[PDB]
DNA sequence: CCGGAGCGTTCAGCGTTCGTTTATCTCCCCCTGGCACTGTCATCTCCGTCAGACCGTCGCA
DNA sequence: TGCGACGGTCTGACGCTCTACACAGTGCCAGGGGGAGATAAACGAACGCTGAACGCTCCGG
């Protein structure tokens, strides 16, 4: 598996694959139910349907396998041969391929200079095509044919003159005889009128035949190859008049004959000549066509695959006709399509056997062509073939395309064995590495292991007896099951699996019931509530799989979230409330025994059990030797005339008993914490523990925190009664005053002194004031003791706006189609809404539900696009030799006389490395190539630095992939990233995970459309897809004088740069709201109008670093407006994948086409190649493209095919005959090999393991 | 004190019975061919995606 | 040729199981060729009958 090739398949290859001809449309016999001979499903062509048997019934045994039966020809072998053995159909008339005709010009190619409508007219038998003309023979005898035509014209004119003379004589004769007879008074006038009517009719006939001769003559005089004529009567006239001069044809045979005489190299030369001298859209034409001609010139694939003579067939087991219970049959649609193809081909053969008219033959040929096209693509042209009358008939290309195709439903995602699924329940008795599997589910997963152990422990005689015991379910089987599942990890997995931690390895443990017991401490890593949530369990099977489960996937090793490096395995519902209650202050709770000395924590616990001491009471408590004092305890000390060190020995501290118990949970080496914990302080404590302590200690400490959090949340006394939710007493008088002034405004409006829009605006303004003020009143009324505030102020669960709309009034609520009702909801959920208030609240609720459904769908789509563009980005080197980096701001927004560090330094500068040392006073502050943390950044900002040159992934120049040092330390593990970690996939998952968490939509348009830019997740998609924004703000090209032009039809802006530069003019709509002065000084940096800048021009006029900063900052301010934090390197990986290409111009010396996508590495290699030859290099402008366009424009066609476009990329690969190296992860998942990342690298699989000499000597 | 008779086992004459084929005689399946007043253009699709892009196409300028 | 715009074309439109189903209006027979099954015979084989015949222990007058 060095690589995988693809190309056009000629008739020879199709015949070589085939084991025979499918000469009959019959599939199976209706009585014997055996496949027919020499047709579809035939055993002679496709192999035996039985095992080692054959059609005629002879040769039943297995011994004489691999022989050809003389009676029927069926080779005796296995039935699975029918999954690999194919045949072919020979066509009576050649037909074209529907992928290449009727497609994109990158796919059709315009190989022959014909329009797509012209190709349609020629191949579907509506117009003849002149494939060959003897041009030199036609031009050599021009005087002879001209003389013949002149002779024909002369004799025609002589006949016309003789006829005119005879007609005149007849007219004179009849006039004379009817004027001599005198039958009527004016019969001579009537006969003269009839005669002249005859004269004009014959003159019309003469002029129409003269025009016919003239038009056929000028049709022959302008006759070239690839010239069509719609009128078959006209072509018949040319054939009957002119012979052996021009060769004509009709249908796909005309294209085949044209491709027989096609001379592609001279056409390529002519297109290159037009490239040298050409303008306009034809230029682009002269570009695109040339590319496809090059695709037929450089590679070895002949264009004989353009039109096909033989049709391959699927092996019959991949288009099965299976028996169904009740005597029915289930048949694939490809059997119907193939049957139609053979039917039409056989009918065409029968028509060609005997004498048939050309119209019937051409009609049957067109039917055969349409049958082949519907076989390859049903529904590409016209109405799709339906069948029973309900749904379109599935074709060959419809299972290589879309969600139902082979690439996405059967290769990337597959069903698995040794897997199960059950609902989850919380088990607090479990450790962090444990999960509770039911008896039946674990017995079914570990069935062969249980059978082997039963055989080994001689409880069963053999495998069959062990299987019978397992199926019966005896108690010794369950004892064996308990013995087996130990030390054998299983992978728990929740279905949405947005990010990396959706699959985690746990040690299984037998539990009762039928539900999986999961640890609470890990649930939010899975985003798993216990409303109802089925989790799947997969079984790592070999030593490698369960080794990776134990080492890489263990749930106790995944404390930190890979998105931003913050801890994720500290859920907050009940444990944080308990720890907060334990560690909170004595505010609002009656402290008994406050301010009394205690000898030890045990005595304080005894006093608490006695009841004369409460948990929250400032007491003077002594601590034994080995207890580390708080970090703030060091500057104070005990007063003594002798030297003392309270860092290692006993000390007294003024604290509550709850803090003493909480620090009993924490390790003895950890410094004492003397503050209210809650949630955020718990986050910094857990982050410090994960940073400074080993994994097992961290797992034990989170287990202790979990256990004591549950324990003290039980005794915290939190509950909900109707007296626990309190409406403010001020709310009644405040809403009374606001209704009084609202009644005053309304009775003022009834006189018409104010418009309704102004009244609505002031009403929503004053009611927003009222709801903010009553929120303030509620936030003043609450005590620190009631459970609802105790669980919203502790970060446990809840938000302040939920308490605002539970205790105080709901506030302004959006109406349908996104405006606000002027009348608010004055009732709290405790008081109960009225009927109409409930209705207008349902207006917003249903919108929210629909919005979050579509938002999570779009987030999944964005995640898929990001993963497919960001793959094949793997740390492949330990370090670069580089010292180039990114200049990031470290301290900003400084006041007078002080310096403040950056607000978002955690996701911008942290977890990176310095490209070079930093010195301010001649001494180094921080070394080079070290991770940045709190203390180092604090030292930098204290010593007085304003910017830091840090080593980023955008500036990485490595020969393969990116290095570990330029990427920086990994955020999932907190250490330096290993060589082989897929950083692109981690980056894509981290970007796409909070897409459903954003929950953003424009509140109100304000009555104007287009004034507001896209916000939320669609803004992120627009940013990553390189699309021009909805509100575009043009950027000035150069510094100069800017002025406005207020033309009535459309506004206009004109800026003239100084230093003789050319003036640039931008058109602006009348609804502009710009911010630049009229006739003022402007430069490149600022924007002329207000809106969202287009990143393409930002790349164009400012540079690649400026547009990198722009994109990173834009996506980070979209994400930061909600509150989600994502590190900058995750964005920068995709941004580097975004700027990887270049658009080339004046490429007359680099010997390739101009104005197309070129990779940076290939362009640079071509630049060295052309400067080593001495020629001047071509020009190249960096091109910023979407993630979809960067995904499709990839070297490997397997990854391109498995992505969105599935038919066009395969045609393009077939024309280009491109073979893909099997590097990358999608085309290694597809083929089944190891991915080239992580444990699948070559540098990890080449180690050899043997024991040491002393270990052998010991035993 | 061998001699004969009865008994055990083992083979050559012709005498019948099997093991496996063969052509002829009913019953059925399956494919090609005949019908002679005249009778010479069907068929319903497809709408309250959807969101914007990519692209060629095309008449106006 | 540049212009918008007109239009067709094309693509996907988070994830799983618990659940999970099936699918409907217009002819008819005669003459002839093959192979499935029943028939009665046939050339060759071996299958039995004929006890005879060789040789042994044998009780023996
Ligand atoms: Mg749930
Ligand atoms: Zn056979
Ligand atoms: Zn590097």
Swiss-Prot record:
One of its GO terms (biological process) is DNA-templated transcription. Zn(2+) 2 binds at residues 880, 956, 963, 966. Pfam families: RNA_pol_Rpb1_1, RNA_pol_Rpb1_2, RNA_pol_Rpb1_3, RNA_pol_Rpb1_4, RNA_pol_Rpb1_5. GO terms for cellular component: DNA-directed RNA polymerase complex. Its EC number is 2.7.7.6. Binds 1 Mg(2+) ion per subunit. InterPro entries: DNA-dir_RpoC_beta_prime, DNA-dir_RpoC_beta_prime_bact, RNA_pol_asu, RNA_pol_N, RNA_pol_Rpb1_1, RNA_pol_Rpb1_3, RNA_pol_Rpb1_3_sf, RNA_pol_Rpb1_4. Zn(2+) 1 binds at residues 54, 56, 69, 72. It catalyses: RNA(n) + a ribonucleoside 5'-triphosphate = RNA(n+1) + diphosphate. GO terms for molecular function: DNA binding; DNA-directed RNA polymerase activity; magnesium ion binding; zinc ion binding. Its cofactor is Mg(2+); Zn(2+). Keywords: DNA-directed RNA polymerase, Magnesium, Metal-binding, Nucleotidyltransferase, Transcription, Transferase, Zinc. Residues 379-399 are annotated as: Disordered. It is an enzyme of class 2 (transferase). Mg(2+) binds at residues 529, 531, 533. The keyword Magnesium applies. DNA-dependent RNA polymerase catalyzes the transcription of DNA into RNA using the four ribonucleoside triphosphates as substrates. The RNAP catalytic core consists of 2 alpha, 1 beta, 1 beta' and 1 omega subunit. When a sigma factor is associated with the core the holoenzyme is formed, which can initiate transcription. Belongs to the RNA polymerase beta' chain family. This is DNA-directed RNA polymerase subunit beta'. It comes from Streptomyces coelicolor (strain ATCC BAA-471 / A3(2) / M145). The gene is rpoC.
């Amino acid at each position: 598996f060095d690589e995988l090739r693809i190309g056009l398949a000629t008739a020879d290859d199709i015949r070589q694959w085939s084991h025979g001809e499918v000469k009959k449309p019959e599939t199976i016999n209706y009585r014997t139910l055996k496949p027919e001979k020499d047709g579809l499903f035939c055993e002679k062509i496709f192999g035996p349907t039985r095992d080692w048997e054959c059609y005629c019934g002879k040769y039943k045994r297995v011994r004489f396998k691999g022989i050809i039966c003389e009676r029927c020809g069926v080779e005796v072998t296995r039935a699975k041969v029918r999954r690999e053995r194919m045949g072919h159909i020979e066509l009576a008339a050649p037909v074209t391929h529907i992928w290449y005709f009727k497609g994109v010009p990158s796919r059709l190619g315009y190989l022959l200079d014909l329009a797509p409508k012209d190709l349609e007219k020629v191949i579907y038998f509506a117009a003849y095509m002149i494939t060959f003309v003897d041009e030199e023979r036609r031009t050599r005898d021009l005087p002879s044919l001209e003389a013949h035509v002149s002779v024909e014209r002369q004799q025609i004119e002589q006949r016309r003159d003789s006829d005119l003379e005879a007609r005149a004589k007849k007219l004179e004769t009849d006039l004379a005889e009817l004027e001599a007879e005198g039958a009527k008074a004016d019969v001579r006038r009537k006969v003269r009128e009839g005669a002249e009517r005859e004269m004009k009719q014959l003159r019309d006939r003469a002029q129409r035949e003269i025009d016919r001769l003239d038009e056929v003559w000028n049709r022959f005089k302008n006759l070239k190859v690839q010239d069509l004529e719609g009128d078959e009567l006209l072509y018949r006239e040319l054939r009957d008049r002119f012979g052996t001069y021009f060769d004509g044809s009709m249908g796909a045979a005309a294209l085949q004959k044209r491709l027989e005489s096609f001379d592609l190299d001279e056409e390529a030369e002519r297109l290159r000549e037009i490239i040298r001298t050409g303008k306009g859209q034809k230029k682009t034409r002269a570009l695109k066509r040339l590319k496809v001609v090059s695709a037929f010139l450089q590679t070895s694939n002949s264009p004989k695959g353009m039109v096909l003579d033989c049709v391959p067939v699927i092996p019959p087991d991949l288009r099965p006709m299976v028996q169904l219970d009740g005597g029915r049959f289930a048949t694939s649609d490809l059997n119907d399509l193939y049957r139609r193809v053979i039917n039409r081909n056989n009918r065409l053969k029968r028509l060609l056997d005997l004498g048939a008219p050309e119209i019937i033959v051409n009609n049957e040929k067109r039917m055969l062509q349409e049958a082949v096209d519907a076989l390859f693509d049903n529904g590409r042209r016209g109405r799709p073939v339906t069948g029973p009358g309900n749904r379109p008939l599935k074709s060959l290309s419809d299972m290589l395309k879309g969600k139902q195709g082979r690439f996405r439903q059967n290769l990337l995602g597959k069903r698995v064995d040794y897997s199960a699924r059950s609902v989850i329940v919380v088990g607090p008795q479990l450790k962090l590495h444990q999960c509770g599997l039911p008896k039946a589910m674990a017995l079914e997963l570990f069935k062969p292991f249980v059978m082997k152990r039963l055989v080994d422990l001689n409880h069963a005689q053999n495998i069959k007896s062990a299987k019978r015991m397992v199926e019966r379910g005896r108690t010794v089987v369950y004892d064996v099951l308990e013995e087996v599942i130990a030390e054998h990890p299983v992978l728990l997995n929740r279905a949405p699996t947005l990010h990396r931690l959706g699959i985690q390895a746990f040690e299984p443990q037998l539990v009762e019931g039928k539900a999986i017991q999961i640890h609470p401490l890990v649930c939010t890593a899975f985003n798993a509530d216990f409303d109802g949530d089925q989790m799947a369990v997969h079984l790592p099977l070999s030593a490698e799989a369960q080794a990776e489960a134990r080492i890489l996937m263990l749930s106790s090793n995944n404390i930190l979230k890979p998105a931003d490096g913050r801890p994720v395995t500290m859920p907050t519902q009940d444990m944080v409330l308990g720890l907060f209650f334990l560690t909170t202050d004595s505010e609002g709770r009656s402290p008994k025994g406050e301010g009394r000395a205690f000898g030890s924590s045990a005595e304080a616990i005894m006093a608490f059990d006695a009841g004369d001491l409460t948990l929250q009471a400032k007491i003077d408590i002594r601590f034994p030797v080995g207890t580390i004092p708080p970090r703030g305890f060091e500057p104070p000390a005990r007063e003594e005339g002798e030297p003392e060190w309270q860092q290692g020995d006993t000390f007294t501290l003024k604290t509550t008993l709850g803090r003493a118990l909480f620090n009993e949970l924490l390790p003895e080496d950890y410094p004492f914490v003397d503050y209210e914990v809650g949630k955020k302080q718990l986050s910094e404590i857990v982050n410090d523990l994960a940073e400074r302590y080993p994994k097992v200690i961290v797992a034990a400490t989170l287990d202790n925190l979990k256990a004591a959090g549950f324990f003290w949340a039980t005794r915290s006394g939190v509950t909900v009664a109707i007296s626990d939710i309190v409406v403010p007493d001020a709310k009644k008088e405040i809403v009374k005053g606001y209704e009084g002034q609202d009644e005053k405004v309304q009775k003022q409006y009834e006189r018409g002194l104010i418009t309704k829009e102004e009244r609505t605006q002031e009403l929503i303004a004053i009611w927003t004031k009222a709801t903010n003020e009553v929120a303030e009143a509620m936030n003043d009324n609450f005590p620190k003791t009631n459970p609802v505030s105790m669980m919203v102020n502790s970060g446990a669960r809840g938000n302040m706006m939920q308490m605002r709309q539970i205790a105080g009034m709901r506030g302004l609520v959006s109406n349908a189609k996104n405006e606000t009702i002027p009348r608010p909801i004055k009732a709290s959920f405790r008081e109960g809404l009225s009927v109409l208030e409930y209705f207008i609240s349902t207006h917003g609720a249903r919108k929210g539900l629909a919005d979050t459904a579509l938002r999570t769908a779009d987030s999944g789509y964005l995640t898929r696009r990001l993963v497919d563009v960001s793959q094949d980005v793997i740390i492949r080197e330990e370090d670069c030799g580089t010292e180039r980096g990114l200049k990031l701001p470290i301290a900003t927004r400084d006041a007078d006389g002080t310096l403040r560090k950056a607000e978002d330094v955690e996701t911008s500068v942290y977890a990176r490395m310095l490209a070079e040392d930093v010195v301010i006073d001649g001494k180094v502050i921080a070394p080079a190539n070290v991770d940045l943390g709190d203390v180092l950044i604090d030292a930098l900002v204290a010593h007085g630095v304003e910017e830091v040159k840090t080593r980023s992934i955008l500036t990485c120049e490595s020969q393969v992939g990116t290095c570990a040092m330029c990427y920086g330390r990994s955020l999932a593990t907190g250490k330096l990233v290993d060589i082989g970690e897929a950083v692109g996939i981690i980056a894509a998952q981290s970007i796409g995970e909070p897409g459903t968490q954003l929950t953003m939509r424009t509140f109100h348009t304000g009555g104007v459309a287009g004034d507001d830019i896209t916000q939320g997740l669609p803004r992120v998609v627009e940013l990553f897809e390189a699309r021009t924004p909805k509100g575009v703000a043009p950027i000035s090209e150069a510094s100069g004088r800017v002025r406005i032009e207020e033309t009535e039809k459309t506004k206009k802006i004109v800026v003239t740069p100084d230093d003789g530069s050319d003036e640039t003019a931008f058109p602006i709509s009348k609804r502009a709201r710009l911010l630049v002065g009229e006739g003022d000084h402007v430069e490149v940096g600022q924007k002329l109008t207000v809106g969202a800048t287009n990143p393409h021009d930002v790349l164009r006029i400012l540079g690649q670093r400026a547009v990198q900063v722009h994109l990173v900052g834009e996506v980070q301010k979209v994400y930061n407006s909600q509150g989600v934090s994502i590190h900058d390197k995750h964005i920068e990986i995709i941004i580097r994948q975004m700027l990887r290409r270049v658009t080339i111009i004046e490429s007359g010396d680099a010997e390739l086409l101009p104005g197309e996508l070129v990779e940076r590495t290939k362009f640079e290699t071509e630049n060295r190649r052309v400067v080593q030859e001495g020629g001047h290099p071509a020009s190249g402008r960096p091109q910023l493209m979407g993630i979809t366009k960067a995904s499709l424009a990839t070297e490997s066609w397997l990854s391109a095919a498995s992505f969105q476009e599935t038919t066009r990329v395969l045609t393009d690969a077939a024309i280009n005959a491109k073979s893909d190296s099997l590097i990358g992860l999608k085309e290694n998942v597809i083929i089944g090999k190891l991915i080239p990342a992580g444990t699948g690298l070559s540098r990890y699989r080449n180690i050899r393991v043997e024991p040491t000499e002393e270990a052998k000597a010991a035993m």
